[model samples]
Target: GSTKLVRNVNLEKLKNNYLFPEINRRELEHIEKHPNVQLISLGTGDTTEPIPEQITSHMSNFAHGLSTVEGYRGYGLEQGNKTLRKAIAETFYRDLHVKSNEVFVSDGAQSDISRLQLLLGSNVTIAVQDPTFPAYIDSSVIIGQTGHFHEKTKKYQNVVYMPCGPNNSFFPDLAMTPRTDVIFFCSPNNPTGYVASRKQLHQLVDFAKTNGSIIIFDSAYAAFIEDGSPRSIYEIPGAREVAIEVSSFSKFAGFTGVRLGWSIIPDELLYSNGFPIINDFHRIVTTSFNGASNIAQAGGLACLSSGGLKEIRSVNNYYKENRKILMDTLVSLGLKVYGGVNAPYLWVHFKGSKSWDVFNEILENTHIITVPGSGFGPGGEEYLRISGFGRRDHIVEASKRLQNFFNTR
Candidate 1:
């Protein structure tokens, strides 16, 4: 009766595990052996703060509505709530000319990016920043885009890897890279924590236009950028024709668990045949997604209000101070470090040492958890990423332990 159910053979193409899962496993084993040791995490970017109060108020109000017929919402609009969509249009995209209908709200940026892959179809070349977020590559593996994992380059055989580093200021060198149907870019990046400036984004926009490539820009950490960084790709001219911007509330308002994000596909973006790609995107959303949680959408709507805006500013500022604490701690140790000024993660490369070796050293000696940069990609080989998303007291404690550990070494 068993003919051996055929699975998506593409599943076999992925690495043994995505980076964080293995990190979690190793951490669990460490705790088992040193049961009495108190451990502190500077590993994951998950938010430690409570959901922004302004946002939580609406979430609770919506949850309460479910208990009464007067306020119950069975199923929200598949594309997302009109109010939330318009809220993004009015605030996030107000000056950029993005319309409410162009915004497709989803669970989070990761999910939205994976779903967006469907738009690129099969016969497409793709380029991603080396040492990029795993989801970009993981989703490619799932969709059969990555041909094979190349051990030599530590890159997918088929996908193009654009090297990024301090030499290039953490932005991919567009001129030297091969052309592709889709390109992934994340600003205030995950591991390196670099935000692209307006001029840099203009260069990116022009590159996409010149190559006929689609820029799937991830702005999940855009909330952390202060000063004059480009908040949206649309802030640059000509971006509307060649770019799709995706963002999340996770880092911005501590909605990681709450899971709300949106993507913009301008209606004007058309194919070689004059068909709007947004039309296909509309079909994808309606057919594949039932919609993000109504409760979360309620919170999202509130996030754009005056109270929510203030909360976002205060919380990001608080985290920024925490970044300074962690960065200063590492910098004082005479380590070669980058990031923390514009983003929530610090990029510290332990030159002349393997990343995992240093990771284990920190965890074993000081009970501190961190990520080995090799897990990100070949570009991150000897580096480690330190996250700043933690309670103020915890950050202070971690900073003290870190300095003590390095000083004694």
Candidate 2:
């Protein structure tokens, strides 16, 4: 008798080269061609600032403590360090009615996105913003929740794409959005950098509640929002019953390299048969995730401290200033730029132009890297996403180059 080993076809369904890799490929191609050319980057959404000393000290001390008999520990709660959980609930969700027990810490949001897929199972239907963070769709595809890809539409048939871009002021029309078992949304959204207003969030909550949909809200860029927009879905009155928030310290506290984040699954959120969503989520964490690094958790605790908060705030302020510099330059060039008002990304529109061509033109001429909009989704076509995370000098240089090139041309 003979047997054949089988692999999951879902993996095959994915588009070649994930977003970041594709961006890197183009970057490397350019570097190979122009080896000596210095590139100023406004393409990547990664944090470039160094971690505040106050925050790093906590992690360093914890690493050293690990050598001591009294400080040595084996494993921690899968739900996260109790103290850190309590601190997060207090610091971010205090008045919003979230409890410490509901927060499950993780290495980062990307890992948690897949874990969430495992918890929800592959049979569920999902909706995502048109130009959303790629993980949601990619993870959903791997879990077999979506239909075959349609090349023309550049989408998975079963996955609903809620277009929320310049056309409707960066907020999707709830009436036009179909009901889905799960909805993936991001505030201070990654590529567009659009922060949802309080009224818009309330509408989202209402839509979810009415449709009996579970909202997976991504607040990874929440700290970049400074305009009093609703940073957490929990701010909405009934959001606790409908939303699960996934947030990270990556951008918030310059913890991208540190790897720490959390997901808040409120007890009020229940399945169709009345089972608490957190119960299943807890099961996934306990079984699959050991926990975030003890040192990272230590760093997280410090990130919420008064001194740590102040330090991180200054770092955020730096990016906001960088955002302003880039925004001002682009606006001065008579370009249509949205975002960078309360977020670290600028969505620049080049109507009737191809995004990749624009990306190449900017890179080749000015030696500044930028992400093509179409990579995010079709809704991002003819646009470019510029990141504000960079060295101040690099940002200024990029701005000058952009201004000079666009103005002279």
Candidate 3:
């Protein structure tokens, strides 16, 4: 039994408890004690909203077409259907001036981001916003790009950790940022709920331009942005020269459980020899990915339609209300909170307390589940992040429970 050769050795480098699985394990243990307890999870980032009728309508047609003669399609365009690609470029990037052929449609931004890492290989250096979506860092570790974790700093040896917190107004300071081959950044960022300002993005774009680093901009939560914040990195000048933007339908159109996403690699992005990266990106897409399903692409196309755009925005408004509900309640309860203004999650801090303990205590006392800030990174150790992706009723109930918990204490 050569079991020693079985798994990816880099897999061992990951922390014992990944955020969601550990949340589920502890939740089950809680139910073991209080069998009658009704638990409401505001922890996992999955959206509970129903897919828009406009999208589902198109998906239904696409699905039924597979059963018919004239409508059937054997395989999708490996880079994605022209209709969807055109819609994404013209609609999402209209203001930014990105073109369709420059876009590569994929199953999900999560998948595309990880696949993008494969192209980087282990030799390149990378930097990530410290309290970032786990995918960016985890994908690097999985590909053997990062070195061993340093316990005291909670950082990977080869990867630079750009600490972002209140002192910098929850934005990573580009002046202090280290030069690396790749820079992973997220706007309307996942755990912290921070959105990049126009000023902030300009600074980052300049930093990447000077360092010759590729910015893997994750806009997974961009649709949740409701302010003057820059939604795409391309909004900043010179971003197209140094950035590759990846966004998902999960938060945008309530496709959280169902996956559909895309990435934009401008032809102008060149290597040291002045060759465009899109040439190799095409090879990666055709060789590594079969293509997004016909049905998902259909749904994605619907999302950009005028009617579909209005419908999804309606749902976004609903979640915006939920964010307001939780954020206001937390503020009234005397807790310090950030986010929920421009993003769906709220970062609440109870100074000097262990975040995981705060997470467990709230779940145990009120049965309202949330993600611990510490689980995000070293920067989140004193906070907890409550999501607005739950049912409206659940959000209101969680708010009441949380408020009651604070009042009782």
Residue-level lDDT of model 3, residues 18-57, one tens digit each, is 7778889998888788888788888877778788777899
Ten residues in sequence with the least summed lDDT for candidate 1: 117-126
The digit string of per-residue lDDT tens for model 2 on 1-409 reads 8669666889778776466787788788888888887777789888888898889988999999999999999899988999999999999997998999999999999999999999998899999998867889999999999888899989897999999888798888998888999999999897898999999999999999999999999999888888888889999999999999999998898788889999999999999999998899999998999999999999999999989999999988999899999999999899999998877899999999999999889988998889888888899899999988899999888887888899777
RMSD each, Å: 1.5, 1.6, 1.5
| Worst window of 10 by summed lDDT in candidate 3 | 1-10
lDDT scores in order: 0.87, 0.90, 0.86
Task: Name the top TM-score candidate.
Answer: 2
Off by over 4 Å in 1: none
Candidate No. with top lDDT: 2
Name the lDDT of candidate 3: 0.86
On the 0 to 100 scale, the lDDT of residue 290 in model 2 is 97
The Cα error of candidate 2 at residue 216, in Å, is: 0.4
Ranked by TM-score, the better of candidates 2 and 3 is 2
